[PDB]
Ligand binder design. Structure first.
Ligand SMILES: [Zn+2]
Lengths: 516, 83, 99, 35, 87, 180, 119, 39, 534
């Protein structure tokens, strides 16, 4: 029940981007992957204990059941998992964008290297309503160069130099800028740190002359965590979202994607599956992070876990983007979104279509321009949907008794009470031919008079793809009238064309009135 | 920002090429959804063919809303335009 | 699936996609690229806009502000693959009607 | 699930018991005052 | 039309029109991704290569206007049926 | 018996083009709103009239015509003290299942406002009386004090939609044949 | 679906049966065909509200309490006493409050005369 | 394994026109469409 | 509880305080300024959602009265009067400390005993700032008009002239930097054609004269020559009745400073001298160097020569202060014995902390600038040994004197086994007490062919410990108000009476559990206020 529902059709007004927080990661995640082993040695066919292709994270087979949402393979939309790290690492994508908001900050008191009224001038160039992405990234370049010309901070007065990479994949803060004023209140303590370690281990006059303060990914977030929200707008981010903190731009938790995007390809070369590149990279991520969690609990060498945490730094910087290998090179996320027809060109820009064909052509003068000839052995395969009306009820009754063996017939049928479809080969046809409730749809074969797209595969210009009428002829190739061969520049020497058919009642009218 | 009556009616009075590719697109599927026709059909199938026939006598019960780029309406019935 | 021995299904490439809009037709363009090819129906939540499974949001478990639409599946998995690293494609919604 | 507590966790003494009464009537004065 | 001559390069498209979906389809893909969420950007979808990805109606061509049904009725029979409110 | 000016957006399939404008949108709003509850308003029954109608639009995909329209319907909201002589067909041992026969029977109203000698007896009676007894299929008089409109859906009987608060506090309450 | 006003007006119980009778009229011969969900629910509402009257012209019901407007502002209860136990003043005591000490005139028997005029 | 209308226990796959749909024998209703192979 | 544990700075504290004891409507706006810095009214309403323009002006005047913001005006050449609004930090510390001033009136005003204004003198602190501002006529026209209020009005000049009752002005309702800009070009009202040469001296003559003006205008609050009016009739003295005055933190934070500084005595000596040294400090906080020291907030602090001068004057004022340099003579009669003075303060000279060491022979003073930085070192290392093993306390002391320590010399200096130190040491990289510094033996800073050094880093070790507790304030305050969300029906029923016999059971457990909240809040707050000597 006795309850009403009222929903409207809705549109997307435009995307907006964000980096989700370190609390948003466990929000949509529902399983946790603490263990390492993919296959349990119980030796069931899908042996997955905790940290693997989990049957309530998702499903990577047509024989299993997604325990979370429901369904075998088509009903699962995928569900996220999450990891937990012992100590943070960098984000390799934000690795460039984490030093730009680091040059502007103080290295001792965590403040922006500007005066009071000067930064009050800069955001006035933000608060006017006319700001595009050109000038906003333009003036962020200009305010960053102002902060690099300011040696000593305003709160505690500690001098700062420059910070840059150390070329592994870590950054170094080139601190002390002496010209002729070596009388710094820090150098004497720096000499005091120098002097005490000259007696013990004397082999240090050479290597301590260069060694300098690093910023490991454990110090950096605890350098970011105490900065104020009153000046995050001076460095690109805005507040008022929970994810507006700069703390969330390095990895502390990482999510696990669903298994639908990384499916277990069963190549059938063995009774075992060739497991893909993502899972066999994610497996040692939790393995290395487990021995650092357990090793520091037990007590291991800090000279040992330093490279392990650097091994964990480099490994997550390859799971995402495998360009940083510096050596068969493993695939990744960024390793497929770019490139020729990896993504965005063969999956989003140019997809693959249904209801097509690709045969050779042969000329025919004796039919008119706007009519192409279609052979019948492809014409009783490529179908076109057709809603029943009181106008066309008489013809479709005679059409449905033909069946899918003679040319002017149908292949499939869908009653409006029926849910999926019904096939015409199996079951009695004449007993089904009598009812045909007028509100349903059937799929006749292609016939003379319908609307067909047709083009050459190397396309020169917009006049290489046109529409035509069809005509059914009993041979085994595509016959067109000869005078239209000059747009297609065909040569009848073994070149093959492809035809398309629209499958609405609206776009069928679209193709004639513009592309006829 | 609202509908402009016949006083400031300042666009072409002509059914452009992109119009009759859309009305005939959106008339014909109503015929496939059991709408009543207005013109004297023959023994006749293919609801696109009956759609372009009905356009000859301008018996389409529709009206086109042309938007100006400033967010303004403009109305045109399908019989008001010529071709 | 690409390949005649793997039953075919031809690639309407990027160069043909430029030649459609030069006609200015905008209705078979969606029909040949998501209707007959890649139609997939996704429930998305209105506030904190991103998708959830059969009837949920799983980041504010309310099951209330959910709108049914249909998107390309090749765009849906992008909203998982780009969501795998720390970039959140927040969607924002309007209705079509009442201009 | 979080271990390692702060070491200030004990029964209230009368030295601060009356001091804590001065808080509960403080916020009741403000909320039942003007605002 | 924006004050200067500029090419059709990666540097050339970075100043024509900054819409991260249209720039994702060019040569450099992911370098326009990370800085987009870093700056908390907000772009409306009306580009041709954008509605293709989102699977929505293109705003140009035969998708400029919208189709309106005539409701062929006036207020001569739109009166209420109100009577005997309270007496 | 009160009016509620609301707005709504509605479609009609194109096979109702032969039926006129007003009667077609009336039918499509009937089976959308008949015997339906509204969140935090009440239960609308039948569309009273049509206040104003707006020009119809069309989705490019569907092909039907879409119309937003404003109207008020009939919805019964008696009073916060209104006498109602309903009937009953059910009795339970913690309150009384006073439920209106014919229209809606989702009403359980307790007894918390009477004398102190009220309990349950398993002998066809409500309790023992210190006085003609009452049974089903007769006019039993009761009034209304509050209601609770909750519409939660915790996906994972007591329909929580339309629940009312009742009383039998004064004399003559329990049967209308005790008076007149 | 937007709510503009909740309590826009007040309609008498006469039009609850009067407009329904027109809706019973254009409903293909209801109640007599022994030899939609609106077909089912309107059965149960046409034989519920008029029963207390049963077991008429609108001009009588429009002029019941027009002469009995002996109030100051508290007059919203004029609509509700139209079928609430006719010809009884011991039931009107529990309907309206503070009238045991305000109405001690012939009005409390004139309320008995208006309520007994139609029953 | 069980059809929705006739509850058929045997399923036949049509390879004639390479639709590769799976149909019950008795009444002819399709059980699955658009097969999902493992490449 | 992970949604609060991660993505919340001390903004989680400040939004909670206005949610704690105030209306809900101002919680969004006071977060909006500090999340943005500065915004005026004409851009305030667009950022927020749910409040109109004059609805803000209805709401903004509420927290303006309780001194929660500090306003400012700026005009443009072409533009009108624009009211840029800033944020107040110390005005909400009154709301934070609000119970501890009540037990500061009692413990500092000790002349009285068995007085019948005990309930009244606690009410005036609840009156002077909870109503916002306060003037003399506000309490004189109460339900008692005369009613022996001459014993009450003349009692207030005892409570005013002891301090922390400074009349407010534009100085308190504005922050400290935006007034420095107006007086800076007030000392730059000099035409450039008087003596133009050696142009680097031109801001020098601007800054040395504005420095004397800033020292003058900070005394304008403390200028007690005009906060008092001599009465020729019926009264000895009274403050001026047309004075609108509030209470501040300056005597309280210095009062809590010595209240904290007395706690090291009971550790470093027994109970005898801990009673002695209480008297030695109570005469000094009436005029001491300021604990926040507002002269170093924002200015020319970035260059070293001026950064030297911010303490080249402060110690000379501290050493030559007449207001605290006591003769070590008159304190013996304050105990309720001249040999016992120079004997019980002989161990004050010999103790390992720099208090009561440098002075003229015979006369003493309490050194300040070199004292509280070791108090910050005293309690912080003691909290390191609190929540984990005292083996970390051995490690914590080991680094400051063995500078830039390695793991080879750590076994010559400290003496434990190599199974329990690395478990303890790694428990202190996580908590930011030590700083790693790697030195390579090969090219490109290779990890394996490298060794490592440590460092104390006395800055980031204390910044972490400050905000680790600042979140721990409102984490308990968030559990306060969710206890008010529960049981919300009967609490308004218990507030409409001014009685079910089983309902009263569920009213006591919710009252004693919230009683432990304010008890433990005072504990961690004393641990937090040690780090405010910055
Ligand atoms: Zn959402």
């Amino acid at each position: 029940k006795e309850v009403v529902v009222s929903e409207t059709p809705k549109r997307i007004k435009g995307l907006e981007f964000s980096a989700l927080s370190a609390a948003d990661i466990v929000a949509q995640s529902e399983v946790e992957v603490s263990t390492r082993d993919l296959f349990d040695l119980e030796k069931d066919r899908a042996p997955k204990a905790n940290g693997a292709l989990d049957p309530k994270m998702g499903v990577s087979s047509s024989s299993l059941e997604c325990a979370t949402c429901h369904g075998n393979l088509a009903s699962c939309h995928g569900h996220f998992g999450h990891l937990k790290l012992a100590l943070p690492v960098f984000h390799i994508g934000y690795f460039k964008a984490t030093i730009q908001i680091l040059q502007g900050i103080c290295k001792n008191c965590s403040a922006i290297l500007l005066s009071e009224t000067d930064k009050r001038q800069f955001l006035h160039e933000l608060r006017r309503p006319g700001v595009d992405n050109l000038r906003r990234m333009g003036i962020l370049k200009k305010i960053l160069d102002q902060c690099k010309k300011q040696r000593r901070c305003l709160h505690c007065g500690a001098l700062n130099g420059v910070v840059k990479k150390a070329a592994a994949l870590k950054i170094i803060h080139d601190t002390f800028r002496w010209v002729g004023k070596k009388s710094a209140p820090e150098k004497d303590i720096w000499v005091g740190e120098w002097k005490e370690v000259l007696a013990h281990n004397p082999e240090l006059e050479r290597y301590v002359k260069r060694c300098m303060d690093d910023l490991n990914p454990l110090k950096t977030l605890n350098l970011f965590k105490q900065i104020k929200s009153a000046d995050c707008e001076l460095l690109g981010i805005d507040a008022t979202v929970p994810s507006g903190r700069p703390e969330t731009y390095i990895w502390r938790y990482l999510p696990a994607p669903p298994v639908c995007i990384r499916p277990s390809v069963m190549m059938q070369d063995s009774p075992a599956s060739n497991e893909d590149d993502l899972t066999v990279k994610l497996t040692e991520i939790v393995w290395t992070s487990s021995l650092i969690k357990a090793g520091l609990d037990k007590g291991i060498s800090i000279n040992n876990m330093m490279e392990h945490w650097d091994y964990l730094q480099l490994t997550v910087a390859m799971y995402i983007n495998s360009d940083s290998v510096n050596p068969k090179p493993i695939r990744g996320f960024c390793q497929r979104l770019k490139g020729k027809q990896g993504r965005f060109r063969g999956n989003l820009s140019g997809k693959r279509v249904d209801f097509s064909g690709r045969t050779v052509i042969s000329p025919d003068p004796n039919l008119s321009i706007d009519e192409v000839a279609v052979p019948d052995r492809v014409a009783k395969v490529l179908t076109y949907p057709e809603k029943v009306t009181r106008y066309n009820r008489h013809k479709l009754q005679e059409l449905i008794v033909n069946g899918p063996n003679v040319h002017p017939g149908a292949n499939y049928l869908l009653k409006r009470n029926e849910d999926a479809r019904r096939n015409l080969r199996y079951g009695d046809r004449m007993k089904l031919a009598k009812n045909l409730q007028i509100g349903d749809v059937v799929e006749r074969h292609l016939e003379d008079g319908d609307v067909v797209l047709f083009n050459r595969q190397p396309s020169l210009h917009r006049l290489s793809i046109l529409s035509h009428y069809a005509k059914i002829r009993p041979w085994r190739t595509f016959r067109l009238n000869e005078c239209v061969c000059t747009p297609y520049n065909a040569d009848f020497d073994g070149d093959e064309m492809n035809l398309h058919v629209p499958q609405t009642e609206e776009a069928r009218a679209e193709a004639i009135n513009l592309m006829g | 920002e609202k509908a402009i009556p016949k006083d400031q009616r300042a666009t072409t009075p002509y059914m452009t090429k992109y119009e009759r590719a859309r009305i005939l697109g959106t008339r014909a599927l109503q015929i496939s959804m059991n709408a009543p026709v207005f013109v004297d059909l023959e023994g006749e199938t293919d609801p696109l063919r009956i759609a372009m026939k009905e356009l000859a006598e301008k018996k389409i019960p529709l009206v086109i809303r042309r938007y100006l780029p400033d967010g303004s309406f403009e109305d045109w019935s399908v019989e008001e335009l010529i071709v | 699936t690409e390949g005649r021995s793997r039953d075919g299904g031809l690639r309407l490439g990027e160069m043909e996609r430029d030649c459609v809009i030069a006609y200015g037709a905008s209705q078979l363009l969606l029909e040949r690229l998501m209707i007959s090819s890649d139609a997939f129906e996704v429930d998305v939540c209105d506030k904190c806009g991103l998708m959830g499974y059969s009837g949920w949001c799983t980041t504010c478990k309310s099951a209330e502000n959910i709108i049914k639409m249909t998107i390309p599946y090749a765009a849906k998995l992008l909203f998982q693959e780009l969501l795998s690293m720390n970039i959140a494609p927040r969607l924002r919604l309007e209705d079509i009607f009442q201009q | 699930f979080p271990s390692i507590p702060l070491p200030i966790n004990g029964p209230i003494t009368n030295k601060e018991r009356s001091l804590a009464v001065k808080y509960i009537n403080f916020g009741k004065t403000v909320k039942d005052g003007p605002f | 039309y924006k004050g200067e001559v500029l090419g059709i390069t990666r540097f050339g498209l970075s100043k024509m029109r900054d819409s991260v979906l249209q720039l994702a389809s060019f040569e450099k893909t992911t370098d326009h991704l990370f800085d987009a969420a870093f700056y908390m950007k907000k772009d409306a979808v009306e580009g041709v290569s954008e509605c293709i990805i989102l699977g929505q109606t293109m705003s140009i061509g035969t998708g400029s206007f919208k189709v309106v049904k005539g409701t062929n009725i006036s207020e001569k029979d739109l009166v209420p049926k109100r009577c005997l409110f309270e007496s | 018996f009160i009016l509620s000016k609301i707005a709504d957006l509605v479609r009609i399939p194109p096979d109702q083009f032969h039926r006129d404008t007003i009667s077609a949108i009336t039918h499509q709003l009937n089976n959308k709103f008949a015997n339906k509850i509204i969140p935090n308003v009440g239960l609308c029954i039948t569309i009273y009239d049509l206040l104003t109608v707006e020009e119809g639009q069309l989705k490019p995909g569907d092909g039907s015509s879409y119309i937003n329209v404003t109207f008020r319907a009939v919805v019964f909201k008696p009073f916060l003290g209104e006498i109602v002589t309903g009937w009953i067909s059910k009795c339970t041992a913690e309150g009384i299942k006073v439920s209106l026969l014919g229209i809606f029977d989702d009403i359980f109203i307790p007894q918390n406002m009477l004398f102190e000698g009220c309990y349950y007896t398993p002998e066809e009676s409500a309790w023992i009386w210190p006085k003609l007894y009452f049974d089903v299929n007769e006019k039993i008089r009761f009034r209304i004090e509050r209601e609770v409109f909750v519409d939660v859906k915790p996906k994972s009987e007591k329909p929580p939609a339309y629940a009312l608060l009742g009383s039998c506090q004064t004399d003559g309450m329990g049967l209308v044949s005790w008076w007149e | 679906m937007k709510v503009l006003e909740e309590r826009n007006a007040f309609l008498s119980d006469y039009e609850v049966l009067k407009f329904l009778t027109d809706l019973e009229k254009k409903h293909l011969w209801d109640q007599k065909s022994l030899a939609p969900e609106l077909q089912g629910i309107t059965r149960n509402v046409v034989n519920y509200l008029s029963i207390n009257k049963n077991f008429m012209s609108d001009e009588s019901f429009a002029e019941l309490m027009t002469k009995l407007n002996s109030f100051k502002l508290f007059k919203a209860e004029k609509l509700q006493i139209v079928n609430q136990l006719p010809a009884n003043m011991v039931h009107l005591y529990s309907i309206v409050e503070e009238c045991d000490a305000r109405f001690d005139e012939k009005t409390i028997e004139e309320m008995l005369e208006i309520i007994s005029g139609y029953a | 394994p069980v059809c929705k209308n006739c509850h058929g226990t045997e399923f036949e796959r049509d390879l004639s026109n390479a639709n590769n749909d799976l149909v019950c024998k008795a009444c002819g209703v399709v059980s699955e469409d658009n097969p999902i192979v493992s490449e | 509880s992970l949604e609060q544990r991660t993505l919340n700075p001390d903004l989680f504290l400040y939004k909670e305080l206005v949610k704690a004891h105030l209306g809900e409507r101002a919680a969004s706006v006071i977060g909006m300024l500090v999340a943005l810095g500065r915004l005026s009214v004409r851009e305030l309403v667009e950022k927020i959602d749910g409040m109109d323009v004059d609805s803000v002006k209805t709401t903004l005047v509420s927290l303006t009265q309780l001194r929660c913001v500090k306003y400012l005006q700026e005009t443009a050449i072409s533009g009108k009067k624009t009211t840029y609004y800033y944020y107040n930090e110390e005005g909400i510390h009154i709301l934070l400390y609000s119970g501890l001033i009540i037990d500061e009136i009692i413990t500092q005003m000790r002349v009285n005993d068995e007085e019948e204004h005990k309930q009244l003198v606690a009410e005036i602190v609840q009156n002077v700032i909870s109503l916002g501002s306060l003037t003399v006529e506000d309490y004189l026209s109460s339900v008692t008009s005369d009613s022996m209020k001459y014993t009450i009005s003349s009692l207030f000049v005892q409570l005013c002239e002891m301090g922390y009752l400074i009349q407010i002005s534009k100085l308190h309702y504005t922050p400290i930097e935006d007034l420095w800009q107006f007086l800076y070009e007030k000392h730059y009202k000099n035409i450039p054609r008087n003596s133009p040469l050696s142009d680097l001296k031109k801001r020098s003559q601007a800054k040395m004269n504005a420095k004397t003006d800033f020292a003058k205008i900070i005394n304008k609050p403390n200028e007690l020559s005009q906060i008092l009016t001599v009465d020729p009739k019926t009264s000895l003295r009274i403050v001026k009745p047309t004075v609108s005055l509030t209470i501040n933190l300056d005597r309280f934070m210095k009062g809590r400073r010595s209240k904290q500084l007395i706690n090291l005595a009971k550790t470093r000596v027994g109970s005898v001298t801990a009673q002695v040294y209480k008297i030695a400090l109570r005469l000094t906080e009436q005029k001491s160097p300021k604990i926040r020291d507002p002269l170093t907030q924002t200015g020319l602090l970035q260059d070293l020569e001026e950064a030297k001068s911010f303490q080249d004057e402060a110690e000379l004022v501290e050493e030559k202060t007449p207001g605290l340099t006591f003769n070590a003579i008159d304190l013996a009669r304050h105990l309720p014995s001249a040999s016992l003075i120079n004997s019980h303060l002989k161990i004050l000279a010999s103790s390992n902390f720099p208090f009561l060491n440098e002075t003229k022979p015979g006369v003493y003073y309490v050194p300040y600038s070199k004292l509280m930085p070791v108090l910050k070192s005293s309690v912080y290392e003691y909290v390191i040994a609190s929540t984990l093993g005292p083996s970390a306390m051995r490690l914590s002391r080991c680094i400051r004197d063995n500078k830039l320590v390695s793991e080879k010399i750590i076994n010559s200096t400290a003496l434990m086994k190599e199974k329990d130190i690395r478990s303890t040491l790694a428990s202190l990289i996580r908590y930011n007490s030590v700083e790693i510094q790697e030195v390579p033996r090969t090219a490109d800073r290779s990890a394996s062919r490298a060794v490592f050094l440590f460092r104390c880093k006395e800055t980031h070790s204390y910044n972490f410990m400050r905000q680790n507790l600042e979140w721990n304030m409102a984490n308990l305050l968030f559990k306060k108000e969710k206890l008010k969300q529960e049981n919300s029906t009967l609490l308004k029923k218990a507030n409409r009476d001014d009685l079910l016999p089983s309902e009263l059971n569920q009213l006591k457990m919710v009252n004693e559990r919230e009683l432990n909240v304010f008890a433990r809040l005072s504990r961690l707050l004393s641990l937090w206020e040690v780090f405010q000597m910055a």
